[PDB]
Design a protein around this nucleic acid. Structure first.
Ligand SMILES: [Mg+2]
Ligand SMILES: [Mg+2]
Ligand SMILES: [Mg+2]
Ligand SMILES: [Mg+2]
Ligand SMILES: [Mg+2]
Ligand SMILES: [Mg+2]
Ligand SMILES: [Mg+2]
Ligand SMILES: [Mg+2]
Ligand SMILES: [Mg+2]
Ligand SMILES: [Mg+2]
Ligand SMILES: [Mg+2]
Ligand SMILES: [Mg+2]
Ligand SMILES: [Mg+2]
Ligand SMILES: [Mg+2]
Ligand SMILES: [Mg+2]
Ligand SMILES: [Mg+2]
Ligand SMILES: [Mg+2]
Ligand SMILES: [Mg+2]
Ligand SMILES: [Mg+2]
Ligand SMILES: [Mg+2]
Ligand SMILES: [Mg+2]
Ligand SMILES: [Mg+2]
Ligand SMILES: [Mg+2]
Ligand SMILES: [Mg+2]
Ligand SMILES: [Mg+2]
Ligand SMILES: [Mg+2]
Ligand SMILES: [Mg+2]
Ligand SMILES: [Mg+2]
Ligand SMILES: [Mg+2]
Ligand SMILES: [Mg+2]
Ligand SMILES: [Mg+2]
Ligand SMILES: [Mg+2]
Ligand SMILES: [Mg+2]
Ligand SMILES: [Mg+2]
Ligand SMILES: [Mg+2]
Ligand SMILES: [Mg+2]
Ligand SMILES: [Mg+2]
Ligand SMILES: [Mg+2]
Ligand SMILES: [Mg+2]
Ligand SMILES: [Mg+2]
Ligand SMILES: [Mg+2]
Ligand SMILES: [Mg+2]
Ligand SMILES: [Mg+2]
Ligand SMILES: [Mg+2]
Ligand SMILES: [Mg+2]
Ligand SMILES: [Mg+2]
Ligand SMILES: [Mg+2]
Ligand SMILES: [Mg+2]
Ligand SMILES: [Mg+2]
Ligand SMILES: [Mg+2]
Ligand SMILES: [Mg+2]
Ligand SMILES: [Mg+2]
Ligand SMILES: [Mg+2]
Ligand SMILES: [Mg+2]
Ligand SMILES: [Mg+2]
Ligand SMILES: [Mg+2]
Ligand SMILES: [Mg+2]
Ligand SMILES: [Mg+2]
Ligand SMILES: [Mg+2]
Ligand SMILES: [Mg+2]
Ligand SMILES: [Mg+2]
Ligand SMILES: [Mg+2]
Ligand SMILES: [Mg+2]
Ligand SMILES: [Mg+2]
Ligand SMILES: [Mg+2]
Ligand SMILES: [Mg+2]
Ligand SMILES: [Mg+2]
Ligand SMILES: [Mg+2]
Ligand SMILES: [Mg+2]
Ligand SMILES: [Mg+2]
Ligand SMILES: [Mg+2]
Ligand SMILES: [Mg+2]
Ligand SMILES: [Mg+2]
Ligand SMILES: [Mg+2]
Ligand SMILES: [Mg+2]
Ligand SMILES: [Mg+2]
Ligand SMILES: [Mg+2]
Lengths: 136, 59, 78, 386
RNA sequence: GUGAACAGCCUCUAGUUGAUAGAAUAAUGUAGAUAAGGGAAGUCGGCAAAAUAGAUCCGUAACUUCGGGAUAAGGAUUGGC
RNA sequence: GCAGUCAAGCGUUCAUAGCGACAUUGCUUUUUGAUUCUUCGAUGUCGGCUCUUCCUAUCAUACCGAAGCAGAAUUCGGUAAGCGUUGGAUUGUUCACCCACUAAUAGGGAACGUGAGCUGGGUUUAGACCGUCGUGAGACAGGUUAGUUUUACCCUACUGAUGAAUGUUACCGCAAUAGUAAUUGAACUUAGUACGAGAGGAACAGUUCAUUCGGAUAAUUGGUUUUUGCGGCUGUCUGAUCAGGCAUUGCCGCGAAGCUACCAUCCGCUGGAUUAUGGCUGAACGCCUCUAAGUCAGAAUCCAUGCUAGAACGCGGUGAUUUC
């Protein structure tokens, strides 16, 4: 998260360690997002960094516009298939894994998010709240 | 402010396809139907106004 | 506090119970336990699973005194 | 050479040796600092962990994303029938430490406590405390000058209390006895309180109240002999490795030519004494209160005992302490509930919790119904009813 | 008998029921299995394991010594009555 | 390899903020050499995995002093090893080099730690191809491929486990010694504030979360299934039915209990004494000085508080104490 995170995400169960691929769910030309890092992650011998709903990763685009490939950009996780628990007691899970490509600020690259979106992320990033349809 | 709808159970909201001669829709055009949100018919804490009808006076 | 009901079986989901599923088209599904969820994942049809509200409603099981008469009329003459 | 990558060690060296404990009843090794300006009260209590359940409450935490919102939370429930005072011990200070000067006992002792003093109760003549009881039958000269002895001396004073295990679904029949430091005022006033309470009974609410931070002192659930991987959080060795892999690859360097106290080895796991702190009391239920498990907001008449009873424990019927979360030790075990050793501000303490709803559905499966009322309402009538 | 079958699996005839035994079910093993989310990030290396698989029908690339490549790849179907 | 002393220079001016020539004094033993004392009736050779401990010449974190410190950032230095120091692409690699995260991704030791601990990729026997050399057999700090990794039941150490004897037995305790633990980041707010011509641009208090570590726990959710608990399916066998047997637990869906996961939930204490350093008073030295006497404030340090064990040759209180 870090930069442009407005608010403080309560801890959500990790679903996407480095090397996962999630659907790219905006309109920017990219189909999928390959996770290479998790921002604000920490260190433990042999632990892979893992992304949760609302985390900012570094990513490359494996399937997408050629001017959008072969380079690393930020992205924001918007949906998680690994279940997790909210403080209201519910264990919930989306049907896919997906983020949207963003810039370090937290602003988005494409104009609209093509899916439902988790509130844990909606609250976290403004420009994502804007671009979403159904949240949670 | 969405209204209830008789016998449309589930105290929640849904989006329905409504027709002439039906509550919560006044068409603008011949043959016009419009898909509109509706609140269910089962009372819940999210209601702003219950509408009630006296049927038997008390004391 | 609201009690939910299982979109597959029709069991009451008291707080913390069961699990919640968000399908890709943003339809939300709630299961009271991992049983209804597995049937739901299996594409089983609740109307064919005997023990479910939807089953019993459809097969008219035990609705005995609900379709009986009542007294809910009025009297005004104003 | 040198690790070549740094990692923390495994496990905490302030919990060695990982041996079995000396007893089922972990020891209160500290008491709250005494403020003699306050009335005399206990400082610990006895009870039996019964089980856990779920709670629903609004949260009051200005600032948090969950301020003014309901959260759901796990809680333990420990069966705390009234304790019963049967003696006082008085300690004095010495340059070798605190030592015990005299006990002084009640005149009549319940067969419950009497059973604790034996290892074969059925065969024995049960002669325990019979000559002591005589000491009353005088004017009482001896017991007085004993109590009198405590007052003139004695830096600290503890009540010997014991549980009424027969008010508990357990099959144990043999009560638990323990000393609790008295922290009210005036060493003399302390033994007066004590002497007055011989054979008398003392209640949980006289020691605890709602939203208090309390500590829990108990012997951990046992697991027997454990290999190095689960007992210490060691890493699994690779699959390819000859002669086993729930091991440690390097038990030590060549020099010091000795395996060291700091390296992990397969040993006992569980059954250690523990002192967990800061377990907020979410509820102090009264035994003779149908609708124990009810709430201002729930209001249905029902006790905290779940459908079909607490799994493996029974049917809580006395007063109880409801504690946020989990407690060291396992169901049916004697637990000590101790007063906090510091006044916490924390903002996390001080939060006056108000329960909305206590779960009461069966634990023996996928509970679906709070009450048999609720159950019948939803199933309707079955082939076995009227 | 199932089945393409001298396969596997069950049976009739015949022949066995031999292999120290009892009680328990700690660690660590050996042989057999399963695992949320991720999916080779593990490792010298996908080592091990997992995936696939029968048959009927559709469909089938580069290249080629024209014989092949080819079950290429990729698909659908299969019970009972 | 690391650290000094002199001070000619560097540094707009200005030797010593930060650096430093010519010289010159040293320390270190993860460099390589020099030696050949130990092992040739054998002390298992490179990495890596795993795991523990230790050093400090400190990368990060705590508190400081200095600056060519306005703020922000940074550099120099002190007390400091309490705590941490990672995920990946290529390479057998140590080393190297990029990618990426991060508070930081410090350097080292422990028979160049660690093979009856693994692995065996490299090296380094026997097969084999190439290149160079050689008449040849064959050779090559040249390139390439394939190539058996043995034993613990002993002693000690270590982890846990019993236990004779100091009247018997039983309950409740004390506390010597030993161990000891928490850690780091961010956001809001302070505040677009202090400082600055501007560009920019902090912090203490307060709040909300988080990382890394640790001790539990199983209400919930997930995993596990010989509950062989219910249901289903194939093949066969019991004349059919009912109900079942067999198929190294036949197979499948669900599956309670138990165990269990940052895949789950809960919890992780506050007093004192100090270091560096800044000071008080104050002489020596009529002046001046934090120091000489005396003394205040003071750090992730230290000792307690807390926490674990309880000396089986440390101890207290207490109950009952046998008649053929
Ligand atoms: Mg994170
Ligand atoms: Mg590794
Ligand atoms: Mg827009
Ligand atoms: Mg389950
Ligand atoms: Mg399951
Ligand atoms: Mg190191
Ligand atoms: Mg005495
Ligand atoms: Mg085990
Ligand atoms: Mg654990
Ligand atoms: Mg092997
Ligand atoms: Mg290990
Ligand atoms: Mg044999
Ligand atoms: Mg055999
Ligand atoms: Mg095993
Ligand atoms: Mg399965
Ligand atoms: Mg898996
Ligand atoms: Mg995949
Ligand atoms: Mg790799
Ligand atoms: Mg790949
Ligand atoms: Mg690697
Ligand atoms: Mg290789
Ligand atoms: Mg490699
Ligand atoms: Mg492969
Ligand atoms: Mg293989
Ligand atoms: Mg599978
Ligand atoms: Mg081919
Ligand atoms: Mg058909
Ligand atoms: Mg000179
Ligand atoms: Mg100058
Ligand atoms: Mg000059
Ligand atoms: Mg060196
Ligand atoms: Mg020699
Ligand atoms: Mg030599
Ligand atoms: Mg040798
Ligand atoms: Mg030799
Ligand atoms: Mg020799
Ligand atoms: Mg040898
Ligand atoms: Mg040796
Ligand atoms: Mg200057
Ligand atoms: Mg200093
Ligand atoms: Mg250290
Ligand atoms: Mg040290
Ligand atoms: Mg690496
Ligand atoms: Mg590599
Ligand atoms: Mg290069
Ligand atoms: Mg590196
Ligand atoms: Mg050396
Ligand atoms: Mg070595
Ligand atoms: Mg060795
Ligand atoms: Mg070996
Ligand atoms: Mg080799
Ligand atoms: Mg090779
Ligand atoms: Mg060879
Ligand atoms: Mg030679
Ligand atoms: Mg080779
Ligand atoms: Mg071979
Ligand atoms: Mg031997
Ligand atoms: Mg062995
Ligand atoms: Mg602002
Ligand atoms: Mg200026
Ligand atoms: Mg740590
Ligand atoms: Mg289970
Ligand atoms: Mg069956
Ligand atoms: Mg059949
Ligand atoms: Mg029939
Ligand atoms: Mg067979
Ligand atoms: Mg943990
Ligand atoms: Mg503590
Ligand atoms: Mg002190
Ligand atoms: Mg002064
Ligand atoms: Mg000083
Ligand atoms: Mg001094
Ligand atoms: Mg002086
Ligand atoms: Mg500390
Ligand atoms: Mg304290
Ligand atoms: Mg002893
Ligand atoms: Mg004694």
């Amino acid at each position: 998260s870090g930069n442009g995170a407005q608010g403080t995400k309560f801890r959500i169960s990790l679903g996407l360690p480095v090397g996962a691929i999630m659907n790219c769910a905006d309109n920017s030309g990219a189909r999928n997002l390959y996770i290479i890092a998790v921002k604000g992650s920490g260190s433990r011998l042999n632990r892979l960094p893992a992304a949760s709903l609302g985390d900012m990763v570094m990513a490359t685009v494996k399937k997408g516009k050629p001017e959008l490939r072969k380079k690393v950009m930020p992205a924001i996780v918007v949906r998680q298939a690994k279940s997790w628990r909210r403080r209201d007691g519910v264990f919930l899970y989306f049907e896919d894994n997906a983020g949207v490509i963003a810039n370090p600020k937290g602003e988005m690259k494409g104009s609209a998010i093509t899916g439902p979106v988790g509130k844990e992320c909606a609250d976290l990033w403004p420009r994502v709240a804007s671009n979403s349809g159904v949240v949670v | 402010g969405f209204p209830m709808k008789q016998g449309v159970l589930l105290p929640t909201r849904i989006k329905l396809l409504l027709t002439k001669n039906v509550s919560c829709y006044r068409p603008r055009r011949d043959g016009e139907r419009k898909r509109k949100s509706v609140r269910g018919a089962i009372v819940g804490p999210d209601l702003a106004v219950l509408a009630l009808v006296i049927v038997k006076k008390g004391e | 506090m609201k009690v939910e009901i299982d979109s597959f079986s029709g069991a009451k989901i008291y707080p913390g119970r069961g699990t919640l599923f968000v399908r890709g088209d943003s339809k939300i599904f709630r299961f009271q336990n991992s049983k209804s969820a597995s049937l739901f994942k299996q594409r089983k049809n609740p109307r064919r699973i005997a023990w479910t509200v939807l089953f019993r409603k459809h097969h008219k099981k035990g609705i005995t005194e609900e379709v009986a008469k009542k007294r809910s009329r009025k009297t005004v003459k104003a | 050479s040198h690790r070549k990558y740094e990692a923390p060690r495994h496990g905490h060296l302030g919990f060695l040796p990982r041996k079995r404990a000396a007893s089922i009843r972990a020891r209160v090794k500290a008491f709250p600092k005494d403020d003699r300006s306050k009335p005399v009260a206990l400082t610990s209590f006895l009870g039996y962990k019964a089980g856990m359940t779920t709670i629903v409450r609004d949260l009051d935490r200005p600032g948090s994303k969950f301020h003014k919102r309901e959260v759901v939370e796990a809680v333990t429930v420990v069966d705390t029938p009234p304790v019963v005072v049967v003696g006082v011990v008085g300690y004095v200070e010495t340059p070798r430490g605190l030592r015990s000067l005299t006990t002084v006992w009640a005149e009549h002792l319940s067969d419950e406590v009497k059973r604790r003093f034996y290892k074969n109760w059925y065969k024995s003549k049960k002669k325990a405390f019979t000559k002591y009881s005589a000491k009353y039958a005088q004017d009482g000269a001896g017991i007085e000058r004993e109590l009198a002895r405590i007052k003139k001396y004695a830096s600290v004073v503890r009540v010997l209390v014991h549980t009424q295990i027969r008010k508990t679904p357990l099959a144990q029949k043999k009560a638990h006895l323990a000393e609790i430091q008295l922290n009210g005022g005036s060493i003399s006033e302390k033994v007066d309180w004590a002497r007055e309470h011989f054979e008398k009974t003392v209640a949980v609410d006289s020691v605890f109240e709602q939203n208090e931070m309390i500590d829990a002192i108990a012997v951990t659930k046992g697991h027997g002999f454990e290999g190095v991987t689960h007992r210490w959080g060691t890493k699994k060795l690779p699959r390819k490795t000859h002669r086993g892999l729930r091991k440690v690859a390097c038990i030590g360097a060549w020099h010091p030519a000795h395996v060291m106290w700091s390296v992990a080895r397969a040993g006992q796991r569980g059954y250690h004494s523990r002192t967990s702190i800061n377990h907020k009391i979410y509820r102090v239920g009264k035994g003779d209160d149908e609708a124990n498990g009810a709430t201002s907001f729930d209001r249905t008449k029902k006790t905290i005992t779940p459908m079909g009873g607490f799994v493996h424990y029974g049917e809580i019927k006395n007063d109880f302490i409801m504690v946020k979360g989990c407690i060291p030790g396992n169901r049916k075990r004697i637990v000590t509930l101790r007063k906090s050793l510091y006044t916490n501000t924390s903002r996390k303490a001080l939060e006056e919790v108000s329960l909305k709803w206590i779960d009461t559905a069966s634990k023996f499966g996928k509970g679906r119904f709070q009450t048999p009322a609720e159950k019948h309402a939803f199933m309707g009538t079955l082939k076995k009813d009227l």
